[PDB]
Chain length 501, copies 4
């Protein structure tokens, strides 16, 4: 199954490969560049590297939680389940150390991905090797075997206690897997799409909350560890609180409380620190916890300032309108009319709709505008019996407008520059010496002046909260220069409306 | 009164229905869609649902305040007023549970409101049912009746104490009414208009302050509850502080203090926590309180950064002007003149007046501009004896300008492109070889070049802080192409001013 | 001196009256509206009201600092200096209470200031009267005189102690002068110009720091007051700390420390609170201090986010340029050239110079642009021997540009659309088959194509970091259509440069 | 070597002199202005002043760390190494005091640098002299010599102890070197280029973290100093904790802990403060620490809100698109197509590319656009065999567009206004009654209508995610009016494509 076990190392066709490479042909050329690279090269955008990084993330979170508790609180932490756990974990981390010499490297100086194993080897030895080589191999068990072979009869003196304490210090080199944890979390969050579509403040504050929990855990383990490597002297907090002979659950609970009282800014344990190890560890935890909590307030502020974005923009613009009205001292009748205007026109959410449609492509503009005006097209007798290209070319030129009742849309006897379609509401056509006529949805008005370039023949007044679509002269002549056969519909309607007067 | 008691379930005509549906005809079609739906369907934007949600909000705030204090601090909390209160409340919550199977559901995937009771039933069973069914029914009294019927003679053993403690745990399922509290507060704040016109930061921080008070209250009740369900062991804070036999007022006061010392970041009660229940509850309250206080700092920051919005924009723009002047190293005479210019021209509040008027409709622009220039129209002899359509079409084209004294507005013998009306201040017309003439409010100048396309015949210098209105050539020719009969007024004035020279 | 003592009540000519009214004639009409109002009406923008508010601010800060310390810590606080101080202060506050019935009221619904004493009386009785009438009159001394006259022989029982404690509670009604303090600080900071030119975040955080100091002071006085009105019971912190018989300096110092430990989030005094007065006062101070400190963090954040405004804008735009270069993966040669371009062109501070000049008036634009190009005008032989109107009309059309060395400004044989003046640097004119010629400051190039509409006759390459001024074709033809006599200078230079080839 | 030791005092040619003066000729004129100034004038932008300020920064950080610990914790701090250290440091600070009378002063009111030694002397005596003259000279050793000479036999009384304590107070005048530290850090960070290219929030928070460490250090020294100058009374924290006779390491560690518990908001030392010196010093440290920590939260917030700038802008704009789609209730098919459109078109980072290219100069625009389209130019047969001036003038006019598959790019029989080049993807040309033809990279389409002004002859539909370059009609006619010889290539291709139909 060397074909099946070789297809996982190359970037398969998905949403991510079709996002990062362009089209499927670039994905195929990338796969051909992978297959010709060498002996089993791992592409970083592949399927094996992704789920391998995910299993290593789960294993690193398990190790960085378990390992300090196993080192500090347990006395002879060399039983068979502990050594089996450390050796299985270090087996996986040596496997990942070896596979990092076969992984393509995404470099932010080239559009391509480095797949030459010599450059991969030199760049991986250049920056992130020594910390991964320290963190992968079991340094403590190597040291125990070396100390066994140098002196076989060494475990009967006061040197042996020093060797056990130095073993418990060397076994904390596995906490250098935080580097691989941070790198694999950043790569995984860049690749995995549900965290990619999230807001960056949310992903950033989840990373911070994870790091705060991890540092509070490690700090509690450190608060117990440094008095544990001193035979619990009479001034450390353990011997003062008489927690030397409790269970490890109570020791870990009170040590985590003593660390957490300095992370979330409370303080202290039972008393003030007394011994110098206590004072300097407490000041270390106070620095780390106050920095992490200041960053937590910073991320909470940056998250809260980006929640109700368009509603906040609407309220900022309407607050500027309020301050404009107060600055020019408008009467409260007009202020009430403007309050009703902004709550009818924008409906609480203000959009830069021109820029939003300008970012989109042409068929998406055509599709959205055909969707947003389907009630108009269904209601109007003209658009329902016309060319859909003509309907779309007309609807891309319209402008949404809202008129309060009583407003004069068109004044009788001025030079007209717009043409109105009615989406919603009714209007009253007032003509001097004639009866007013109501117009409703689907009906349009103000088209004789766009055909004849004369002056307005009849005033038009609103009756309800009218929602109209305006059309300029230039766009109307442009769309009729596209389609001169639909001009005769407006000429028929305008001749009939001149016949009514 | 089935007509009167059926008109409340449908959305009546108000500001909210005329905002959310369009006009009154859409409200009537919505009411006809409600009346044809089925057996007593409740519309969510109606009048019954609104005030029913308001009474349920008052009842839930009362329940979530009272119920934990009644469970934790009182010993045999099964007297008649307590059971009457629980049964009346659970009656109201079962009524609201039943009415949620008849309420229209506003879904953010359709412009319509779902009124089909089958879809209402399936969607309500889909997400928010199990928590409301747990929180509505009295689980504890059902459990007491079931335990009574299984064993009648059960209340004489050590099982009975366990049944009483399990009753006090099951009675905390009424604290799952926080879900209905949060949902009904969000719907009520969306509907009720005085919180709708508020800034979203204010409504958001009021919701947070309510939740902080509620979590501090529940946390104090929890800090007493977990030692109360352990017969007050000798390491809990109650038996250490000898508060086992105090009144419930003092127990609740000190428990609320012990919770609140961790909410507002102070710490602790009398001593450090000792027992493991104390340590883990204290760390729980430290997480909850530090998170709520970090969010409180975040909302206070987001509120404070949006208070004096246009004044902050004015000071940002003037700070950029200050840094421009310092970057180009302007002499302090010009810096003083620019400081006086920005404090005369904008008067401390800077508005994007072009965009503010561009968002408004046409009659509101006409009405605001007729208001802001009524001193000019009353002062000028031309505008007070003219067509109000002409006055409005002229005033929409003017541009407000401010000139410091000594400034040359018009230099003698250049090609003129603007025309100035005087709102406030006096100017000196200087002509080579002739006497200067003062012009005051209502008088205009710079109009011969807009009629003749020649060059400027006389320089004009300011005398005070002049507030003028400028008019371009193109707008002047446009407005006279509208109204060619008002051209003769300017031709008469220009012929008289050429006659003066 | 009724003329001299009547000129202070009306707004004199200053920067503030010439800012808020327009010109000096509006100030004179305002003074005539003041003088005709009635019996000694005080204008709110005057000189008497300003310095009267300032003396009342100093007196209120003195009273709100001194009065709680005098009430709480001193036992029989009825010696002659204390009563003289209270009676002199209440004399001033009754004077200000009376003068508030003669002060003009600035209302944010009218451009005018209300000077009718009936509307002043009704509006002042409407909102801010009852709190000022309580805070001005001595309620405690009136109560002592009334209690003296009801029972002369009352000071020999247990009623007398209750009357003394009720006197010390009634004397805290003078702490309702905080309302007048807040109102007069807001009016004074609006009027006084050195705080008006300050950034609003600075003034706002100074107001907050003042309020935080005042609430910490009052809270320390309250922490001592409530145990002082209980004969110091055995569970209050005073009798626990044995501070009942200390001096008042030590009592005030430790009470202010006990309040301040809850304002700046530290906690506590010597121990936890024990009595219920201690617990509820400590929770009150924890609410007040945590709210004030969250607002202090909010104002510090809003202040810090607006300090290096144009430098922050430059670094935001250059960070976007960096991310553009990294997104398109530009080679590091071009990235170094763009880094040098942004550090030569903008010099670390990026200005929206088009908008900054567009906000200014015409003579200020002319004056700034004549200042910023005086080295060019002094260096060029053309501008130093020309019409200053021509120089200014040319300099308003120029555009500043920066070219790195090696760049081809003009390529030989293209259609030219710009004309370059050299402010700084030297260029090499390269012509096919001819020798290169250096051009230096004052010399201009690229003008034959603007006179002849042909194609470029010679390439031009930069030699140093050239700072040039570009001039478009349209502006060049516009300025020569203004002044056709300066065309012959460019025609002479262009004929000479064609003669050189 | 007076030439070599005189070249360091003048600004040499580097990136900084070529940034701040313009070109190398202005640097040479600045050097000639330096050399003619007087007896050894130091230019502030030179090389000697920079590294002299750097050595003084290192020496001031050393002094402000060491000096308070040497004064407070050591008893008879007058051994030979301490006096040698103070005298060597004060020698360097007197040297810097003298050299400040020879340093050019950058004033923010002139483009030039003041090098007149009279103005340098008067301005340096005007503002920053008295604090530098106090901080430079050893006041304590002068006082000891003066007290020795006034009374030789003075060191045998109770006056001598007062003289030693007054010596330890006068020796804290060396802590006024913080002024020179702050000024030299601000000048050094303005000059040194790696901190100049940093974001200002990073430099500002590094300055704040340095000041917080320094104030925590000085506050710990003060917390020990004020009980040290009182013979350790029985109520200070030293005699309560029995730390009077510990080593100075333990005294400094616990004093720094007692200061730091109030800086990072924890509190307290062993108990509450008792003596009045303890209470007022603790309240001083609480003010200073709470202010510094509120500013630290402010700088962390201002840093975090400016990290992923273009990604945050992309997510803000796409959140506005999401709220647009939810506001108009688009069907989820179109929402999925718009999600794929924004993740193909912008790829997670949204740039204002028009403004970014508009800020750049002309050759940098030409170079970036020739880089970003080299795959197109290499792929197209036209551009690879053409004038590079023509290629660049064409590529400056193109517009990048992205079409999803299935989209109709060009509809058959409309009036065409654009011309499409294919960068990536394939399209299907559909013609009525003919076979579809695939077009791939390098091929262009939609050019017959730009040559003939007719209507579209064939529809074009996308097949993959097409990345195209559009070209308008006006730019196409402009570029062919530049180069009429490349029109015949498009005429040949269009005649061949008409021949295919
Ligand atoms: N004697 C005058 N009295 C009033 N206005 C004048 C007089 N002379 C010139 N003006 C005005 O000054 C303007 C300067 O430019 P115009 O000549 O275009 O139009 C001129 C008139 O409006
Ligand atoms: N048979 C064809 N092969 C290639 N391109 C074609 C063919 N027919 C039409 N086109 C292209 O499709 C375009 C559609 O609009 P035009 O007719 O303006 O220009 C057309 C050509 O560029």
């Amino acid at each position: 199954m060397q074909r099946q076990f070789g297809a996982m190392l190359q970037p398969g066709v998905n949403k991510f490969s079709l996002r990062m490479f362009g089209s499927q042909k670039a994905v195929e050329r990338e796969q051909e560049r992978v297959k010709s690279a060498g002996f089993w090269i791992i592409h970083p955008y592949s399927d094996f590297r992704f789920y391998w990084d995910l299993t290593m993330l789960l294993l690193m979170v398990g190790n960085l939680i378990i390992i300090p508790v196993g080192i500090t609180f347990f006395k002879d932490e060399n039983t068979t389940p502990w050594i089996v756990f450390n050796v299985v974990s270090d087996t996986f981390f040596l496997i990942d150390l070896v596979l990092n010499f076969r992984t393509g490297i995404v470099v932010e100086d080239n559009t391509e991905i480095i797949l030459d194993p010599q450059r991969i080897k030199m760049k991986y030895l250049k920056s992130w090797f020594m910390v991964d080589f320290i963190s992968s191999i079991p340094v403590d068990y190597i040291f125990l075997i070396v100390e066994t072979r140098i002196d076989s009869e060494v475990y009967k003196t006061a040197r042996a206690l020093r060797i056990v304490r130095f073993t418990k210090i060397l076994s904390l080199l596995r906490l250098l897997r935080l580097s691989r944890l941070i790198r694999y979390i950043h790569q995984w969050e860049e690749i995995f799409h549900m965290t990619y579509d999230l807001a960056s403040a949310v992903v950033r504050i989840v990373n911070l909350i994870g790091m705060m929990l991890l540092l509070c855990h490690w700090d509690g383990c450190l608060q117990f560890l440094v008095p544990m490597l001193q035979d619990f002297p009479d001034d450390c907090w353990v011997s003062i609180n008489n927690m030397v002979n409790n269970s490890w659950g109570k020791q870990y609970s009170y040590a985590l409380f003593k660390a957490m009282s300095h992370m979330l800014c409370i303080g202290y344990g039972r008393q003030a620190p007394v011994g110098m190890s206590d004072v300097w560890l407490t000041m270390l935890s106070m620095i780390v916890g106050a920095t992490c909590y200041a960053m937590f307030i910073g991320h909470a502020t940056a998250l809260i300032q980006s929640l109700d974005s368009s509603r906040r923009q609407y309220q900022e613009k309407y607050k500027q309108v309020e301050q404009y009205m107060s600055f020019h001292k408008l009467p409260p009748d007009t202020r009430q009319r403007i309050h009703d205007y902004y709550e009818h026109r924008y409906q609480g959410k203000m959009f830069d709709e021109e820029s939003i449609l300008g970012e989109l492509s042409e068929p998406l503009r055509e599709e959205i505008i055909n969707f947003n005006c389907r009630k108009l097209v269904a209601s109007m007798p003209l658009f329902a019996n016309a060319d859909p290209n003509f309907v779309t070319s007309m609807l891309t030129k319209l402008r949404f407008e809202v008129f309060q009742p009583g407003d004069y849309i068109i004044r009788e006897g001025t030079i007209g520059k717009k043409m109105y379609f009615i989406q919603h509401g009714v209007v009253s056509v007032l003509t001097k010496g004639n009866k007013e006529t109501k117009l409703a949805d689907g009906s349009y008005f103000g088209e004789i002046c766009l055909l004849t370039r004369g002056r307005r023949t009849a005033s038009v007044r609103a009756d309800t909260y009218c929602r109209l679509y305006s059309l300029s002269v230039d766009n109307f002549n442009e769309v009729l220069e596209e389609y001169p056969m639909m001009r005769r519909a407006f000429e028929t309607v305008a001749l009939d409306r001149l016949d009514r007067i």
